[PDB]
């Protein structure tokens, strides 16, 4: 089976001439598309007559209604937009198509040759008749007799350039997808192009291909393989330094991952603290709102305020408050809205249910409510806009240490891990207060064999400190898989290798680290006191950027990603985009949750200021 | 610059008119391509006349010295070759390239257009002149005076089609790569094409670029990202089950990673055993060659012979022979050339230097020599086929309670960890075996050494638990009973711990059904581990006792695990590449070797 397709200009003999390209085998179905010019209609009748005679195969004559003649580029494109549509309907496949570019404009033959290499074809050929006919014998065949003279006298030359396989994304463009309006004005199919959709599709299938092939070299330096379809000018933008003020609208739209977030430090002051209190189940046991003054310049202080002072800023929330069932519900719902305004796709919230247990509300009752308040908010959100929330139970700070309180949280986490197997889950424990030397014994004095034997992951909170010996015991004694605020790894080069090669992730909180211990800002060169984010990446450490306390720090996740530009000199926009892939791998998520998080991470927003 | 390329034929006024595309500014140097036909010569003389009477931009006239009239596609093939090469010489840049497809045959314009669509161009226009000239005012301006009036009277209408982006890997082709010979028969540069490289290097690019696009979406499933450039038939042959008869040549040519290989069990008998004894420094001390019979069916025994009988099968080599300084070189060199013949790109050899120490050669002297016998062999191999060898020290539990050997090996590994920073390195210790939990393996962890633990012959699930969390093992050897504990099989996958599996050593020790029509209750746990997300690696263990190379071990999986595909054998190599104890420099060099996957030969 073989379709024939050719363009007809002012000479119609080409169509009967191409009929002999296969000797006497001909074509199983021929088609002719030409213009609406008044000089073409006269040739239509001749082909109709010649189609009336020798009517072996099926015939069809079509003319572009909206293309009289070539006056401007708008005309060629108009006919170009129709050729592909007509080329799909008449020719459904690419292995049966045969094309001739004899009749038509020099820009119409170019529209025929190009059109074949895009949707695939079996062959493209040309015809050239000897000018040994007509009066004086110095002209080519122009009558039904002269044409048959050259047909029977071997006066036609066929220049067959060769077949075209076609591109992969265009061999499935079916004509029904791009309908062509055909009018039956007798034996002529006058066609009209409804929309320019097909052209807007091919230009989108060949534009994306050229971008992928230009990025098939650094495809291993790209954290997200979906960045390949990005224009080369955009990929050069991605490789330049981050701008904290120009990229705010790009970082704010990134699908991010949260791994370090305390539930009790969320709404500590401002319009949010007063909103949590208004939800109290009994607005009579709420303690008086203290007056905790934020240090000057908050969120960016003038000097570090130490860890002890940093905790005290969250005294209007936490253990006091949220013991009320109504105020706890508000926190678990006002916090999920924050994770939706940051475009966070996966979050692990750190909670201490034993801090919220009253005489009638056991730690399990509190933990069961926290899980169900996030699971309801998760279910009331579209699957494409839904932030997945998992829970970590915290072995708290110096408030802990007692044997009768660090093993109650471990038992609570073990029971919860086996309880919920879908939706919001308890995925691990957070050994906070690990930097407390007194509580250090309590952490190593308690057995963690049950925690590891049930599949719960351990993350260690290496807060403000300089004891590199604690990090060694966290990796090898507690089998921790993540490290919190490990800001002095570069000092011990031998420990930086162990962390990098073993795959332990490091949780860095830009704002919390700046407000507690302080770091140089905007320095033109990397010195000795500089933030270690860029040194960890060079050493092969899987670093992640988190918020820690959305309320105490007064900075969102976007404000933490932007501060790295002013905190690490030279950090690029592919570096921040790379920490989101490290976080996705450091998350204590199962296969189902990971597969849903990579889909969200593979939707990096396109930049807008890629013009210089 | 605004270089312009013009094609000419029986009409020559196109070039003088095409030069007006830019208006009064014009071009800086317009170039013309022409054939060898005599009929075009009158235009050529007129074209030179126009150029000489219109001085300015560099004017060049080139004729196709091997094409005179369109007769067959052979002429067409020769036209494009020169055309592309001609366009690669007269117009180097893609922003200075202005092309006019008017002049020439009907197939010439397509080549002038298609070629632009492949190499790009600033513009490929089309100048049309009003037929208001000639003696009767009916023909297009043909003479010198008519062309001027056509330009002067604005009888020109240029049909601009647009610029051309081209293709990324094709928008770099320079002139010297595909040169040309221009015979100066006067002001005309008669050009000709020597070879056809500019049509085989181009036609093949679009072949590879369509494979990438087709297989790009189906990516992230290929362990090696470079496989996307494979033909779809090849990329679909990769997803079919392995066939350990027809694939003995593709598996043999694969770059492989060796993570479990014992030095002392290499040349245990046969021709290799005598080539190690033959090089002994003190032939008067070589022990007599004990008679050790191999169970019938070796390497495939009719029944599992257990571990105790397996060890005794290699009693003609090892500490018996390796205490000789000369026999320790043949072992280290006859072993490195066995990995070269197997295409191994990175290997970790397990040795016990304390078993070869005499009263004059301390364990450090033996290790000092083993390291330099591998480093010397590595440096004497080209850096293209060079297998990088690292060393693990095996601290085997002894059946005397004698833990002095354990102490010497652990101290030796810590000492050698800092000594060597390049070339062959001691990268970890092998805990081939409660005492180790009282051994205080912390010091090896503090110096950066990795730990590998052989899983005992018993189904000691509590043993694999303590290796992961007490010994902090990063790899597990012979952990065939992981599926027993569903919670353990999930901890191993989530922590990224790798499992070292030896298809022959496991078959000849425990025994597994072979070529069973479907998965059963006593099948090799390869596919079960892979499905559970466990990082699995296939090794040789003892290349001498087992009598099988790394290639044979990979093929035996086609029988132990029915339905295993050829993409899985590549996954095990990527898992090994990430489970290796190599550093960044070594890992970077190993990824380059892995990326050179051999291409399937049948595919049909
Ligand atoms: N620095 C921190 N370390 C650990 N958990 C913290 C920290 N700050 C806040 N939290 C979170 O707060 C919750 C319990 O602590 P909470 O905020 O109630 O503090 P507290 O010590 O009980 O008293 P206060 O009311 O003065 O804050 C848990 O979610 C815990 O994760
Ligand atoms: N498949 C196996 N399973 C367990 N242990 C093994 C296996 N293969 C070898 N071993 C033991 O592991 C250690 C590896 O050391 P190696 O084989 O290089 O030494 P050797 O020179 O053969 O020692 P020997 O003096 O015992 O003969 C030895 O104890 C060897 O017996
Ligand atoms: Mg031995
Ligand atoms: Zn914290
Ligand atoms: Zn072993």
Q: How far apart are CA B512 and CA B504, in angstroms?
A: 10
Q: Chain centroid to CA A236: how far?
A: 18
Phi, psi of A306 (to 5 degrees): 65, 165
CB contact under 8 A, B106 and A110: no
Structure token digits, residue B75: 């002429």
Q: How far apart are CA A59 and CA A44, in angstroms?
A: 12
Residues ≥6 apart with Cβ < 8 Å to B485? B461
> Which 3-state string (H, E, C) describes A428-470?
EEEECCCCCHHHHHHHHHCCCHHHHHCCCEEEEECCCCCCHHH
Phi, psi of A345 (to 5 degrees): -100, -30
Q: Chain centroid to CA B582: how far?
A: 19
Question: Per the omega criterion (within 30 degrees of 0), is the bond before A299 cis?
Answer: yes
Question: Per the omega criterion (within 30 degrees of 0), is the bond before B299 cis?
Answer: yes
Residue whose tokens read 């009064």: B24
Assess contact for A607 and A235: CB atoms under 8 A. no
B312 CA distance to ligand 2 middle (Å): 10
Q: How far apart are CA A467 and CA A434, in angstroms?
A: 11
Helix axis angle for B327-340 and B363-379, nearest 10°, is 40
DSSP B581: -
For ligand 2, atom 28, the nearest C-alpha belongs to: B396
DSSP A164: B
B119-146: burial string, b at 16+ Cβ within 10 Å, e else: bbbbbbbbbbbeeebeeeeeebbbebeb
Phi, psi of B573 (to 5 degrees): -70, -35
Considering CB atoms only, which of B73, B210, B225 is closest to A167?
B210
Q: Go through chain A and tell me how many residues it has.
A: 612
All residues of chain B having their beta carbon less than 8 Å from the beta carbon of residue A101 are: 106-107, 110
A609, burial (CB in 10 Å: exposed 0-12, middle 13-18, buried 19+) = exposed
- Own/partner pairs for A248-254, CB < 8 Å, 24+ apart? A248/A558, A248/A562, A249/A608, A250/A573, A250/A605, A250/A607, A250/A608, A251/A558, A251/A561, A251/A562, A251/A576, A252/A342, A252/A343, A252/A558, A253/A343, A253/A605, A254/A343, A254/A558, A254/A561, A254/A576, A254/A577, A254/A580, A254/A604, A254/A605
Phi, psi of B18 (to 5 degrees): -60, -25
Assess contact for A134 and A142: CB atoms under 8 A. yes
Q: How large is the C-alpha radius of gyration of chain B?
A: 36
Q: How far apart are CA B81 and CA B169, in angstroms?
A: 18
Assess contact for B247 and B238: CB atoms under 8 A. no
Assess contact for A483 and A271: CB atoms under 8 A. no
Residues ≥6 apart with Cβ < 8 Å to A609? A237, A246
A548 CA distance to ligand 4 middle (Å): 5
CB contact under 8 A, B469 and A476: no
**Ligand lying closest to the C-alpha of residue B318:** 2
Assess contact for A79 and A36: CB atoms under 8 A. no
Assess contact for B29 and B1: CB atoms under 8 A. yes
**Ligand lying closest to the C-alpha of residue A357:** 1
Resolution attained, angstroms: 2.7
Q: How far apart are CA A429 and CA A412, in angstroms?
A: 10
Q: How far apart are CA B363 and CA B391, in angstroms?
A: 14
A314 CA distance to ligand 1 middle (Å): 8
Comparing C-alpha atoms, which of A277, A260, A330 is closest to residue A552?
A260
All residues of chain A having their beta carbon less than 8 Å from the beta carbon of residue B225 are: 219-220, 225
Residue A379: strand, helix, or coil: helix
Q: What are the angstrom distances between the C-alpha of B408 and each of A408, B453, B526?
A: 44, 18, 35
Residue B244: strand, helix, or coil: coil
> Which 3-state string (H, E, C) describes B469-496?
HCCCCCEEECCCCCCCCHHHHHHHHHCC
10 Å Cβ neighbour count for A209? 21
Assess contact for A4 and A102: CB atoms under 8 A. no
A399 lines ligand 1 (CB under 6 A): yes
Assess contact for A109 and B110: CB atoms under 8 A. yes
A151, burial (CB in 10 Å: exposed 0-12, middle 13-18, buried 19+) = middle
Q: How far apart are CA B597 and CA A378, in angstroms?
A: 45
Residues ≥6 apart with Cβ < 8 Å to B360? none
Residue A321 region, left (φ>0) first, then alpha (ψ -120 to 50), else beta? left
B559 CA distance to ligand 3 middle (Å): 28
Phi, psi of A38 (to 5 degrees): -60, -20
Q: How far apart are CA A196 and CA A302, in angstroms?
A: 60
Question: E strands along B138-188, which residues?
Answer: 156-158, 181-184
Comparing C-alpha atoms, which of A458, A255, A238, A235 is closest to residue A340?
A255
Question: Which neighbouring-strand residues pair with A190?
Answer: A63, A183
Method: cryo-EM
Residues ≥6 apart with Cβ < 8 Å to B277? B283, B286, B289, B321, B327
Q: How far apart are CA A378 and CA A336, in angstroms?
A: 8
Q: How far apart are CA A409 and CA A419, in angstroms?
A: 15
Torsion, Cα A539 A542 A544 A548, to 10 degrees, reads -90
Q: Chain centroid to CA B101: how far?
A: 42
Residue A261: strand, helix, or coil: strand
Helices (H) and strands (E) in chain B, counts: 23, 17
Q: How far apart are CA B386 and CA B593, in angstroms?
A: 10
CA triplet B27, B30, B31: central angle to 5 degrees? 160
Question: Which neighbouring-strand residues pair with B183?
Answer: B190
Pairing of strands B450-454, A3-8: unpaired
Assess contact for B127 and B100: CB atoms under 8 A. yes
Task: Kindly list the protein residues whose Cβ atom lies closer than 6 A to any atom of ligand 2.
Answer: B 262-265, 307, 311, 314, 318-319, 322, 350-352, 355, 394, 396, 432, 454, 505, 541-542
Q: What are the angstrom distances between the C-alpha of B172 and each of B118, B153, B179, B281?
A: 11, 41, 15, 61
In this complex, how many residue pairs, one in chain A and one in chain B, have their CB atoms less than 8 Å apart?
112
Torsion, Cα B479 B485 B490 B493, to 10 degrees, reads 0
Pairing of strands B127-129, B156-158: antiparallel
């Amino acid at each position: 089976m073989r379709i024939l397709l050719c363009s007809v200009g002012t000479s119609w003999a080409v169509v009967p001439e191409a009929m002999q390209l296969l000797g006497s085998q001909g074509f199983d179905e021929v088609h002719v598309l030409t213009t609406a010019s008044s000089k073409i209609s006269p040739g239509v009748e001749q082909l109709l007559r010649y189609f009336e005679m020798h009517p072996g195969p099926r015939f069809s004559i079509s003319r572009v209604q909206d293309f009289e003649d070539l006056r401007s580029e708008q005309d060629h494109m108009l006919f170009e937009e129709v050729l592909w549509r007509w080329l799909l309907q008449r020719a459904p496949q690419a292995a049966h198509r045969y094309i001739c570019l004899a009749g038509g404009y020099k820009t119409i033959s170019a529209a025929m040759q190009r059109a074949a290499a895009l949707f695939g074809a079996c062959e493209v050929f040309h015809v050239l008749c000897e000018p040994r006919f007509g009066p004086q014998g110095n002209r080519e065949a122009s009558t039904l007799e002269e044409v048959e003279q050259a047909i029977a006298t071997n006066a036609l030359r066929f220049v067959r350039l060769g077949p075209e396989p076609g591109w992969p994304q265009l061999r499935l463009l079916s004509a029904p997808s791009f309908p062509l309006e055909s009018t039956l004005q007798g034996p002529v199919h006058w066609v009209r192009a409804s929309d320019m959709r097909l052209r807007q599709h091919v230009e989108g299938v060949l534009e994306r291909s050229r971008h992928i092939l230009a990025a098939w070299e650094g495809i291993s330096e790209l954290p997200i393989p979906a960045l390949a379809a990005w224009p080369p000018s955009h990929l050069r933008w991605l490789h330049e330094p981050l701008d904290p003020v120009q990229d705010k609208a790009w970082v704010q739209a990134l699908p991010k991952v949260e791994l370090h977030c305390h539930l009790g430090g969320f709404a500590t002051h401002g319009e949010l603290l007063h909103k949590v209190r208004q939800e109290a189940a009994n607005p009579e046991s709420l303690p008086p709102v203290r007056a905790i003054p934020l240090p000057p310049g908050w969120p960016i202080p003038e000097e570090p305020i130490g860890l002890e002072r940093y905790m005290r800023l969250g005294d209007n929330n936490g253990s006091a408050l949220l013991k009320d069932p109504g105020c706890l519900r508000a926190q678990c719902r006002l916090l999920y809205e924050a994770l939706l305004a940051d475009h966070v796709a996966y979050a692990e919230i750190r909670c201490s249910p034993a801090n919220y247990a009253s005489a009638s509300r056991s730690p399990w009752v509190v933990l069961q409510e926290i899980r169900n308040h996030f699971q309801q908010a998760m279910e009331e959100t579209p699957e494409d806009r839904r932030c997945h929330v998992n829970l970590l139970l915290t072995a708290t700070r110096e408030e802990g240490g007692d044997r009768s309180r660090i093993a109650r949280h471990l038992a609570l986490a073990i029971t919860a891990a086996e309880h919920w197997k879908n939706g919001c889950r308890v995925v691990g424990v957070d050994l906070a207060g690990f930097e407390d030397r007194t509580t250090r014994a309590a952490m190593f004095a308690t057995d963690f064999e049950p925690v590891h034997r049930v599949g719960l992951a351990v993350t260690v909170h290496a807060g403000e400190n300089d004891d590199v010996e604690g990090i060694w015991q966290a990796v090898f004694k507690l089998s921790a898989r993540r490290l919190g605020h490990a800001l002095h790894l570069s000092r011990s080069p031998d420990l930086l290798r162990v962390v990098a090669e073993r795959g332990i992730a490091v949780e860095l909180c830009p704002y919390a680290n700046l407000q507690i211990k302080g770091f140089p800002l905007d320095e033109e060169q990397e010195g000795s006191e500089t933030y270690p984010l860029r040194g960890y990446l060079a050493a092969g450490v899987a670093v992640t950027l988190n918020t820690d306390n959305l309320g105490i720090s007064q900075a969102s996740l976007t404000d933490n990603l932007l501060l790295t530009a002013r905190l690490c000199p030279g950090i690029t926009r592919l570096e921040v985009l790379k920490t989101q892939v490290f976080a996705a791998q450091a998350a204590f998520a199962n296969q189902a949750e990971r597969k849903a998080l990579w889909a969200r991470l593979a939707q990096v927003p396109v930049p807008t200021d890629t013009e210089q």
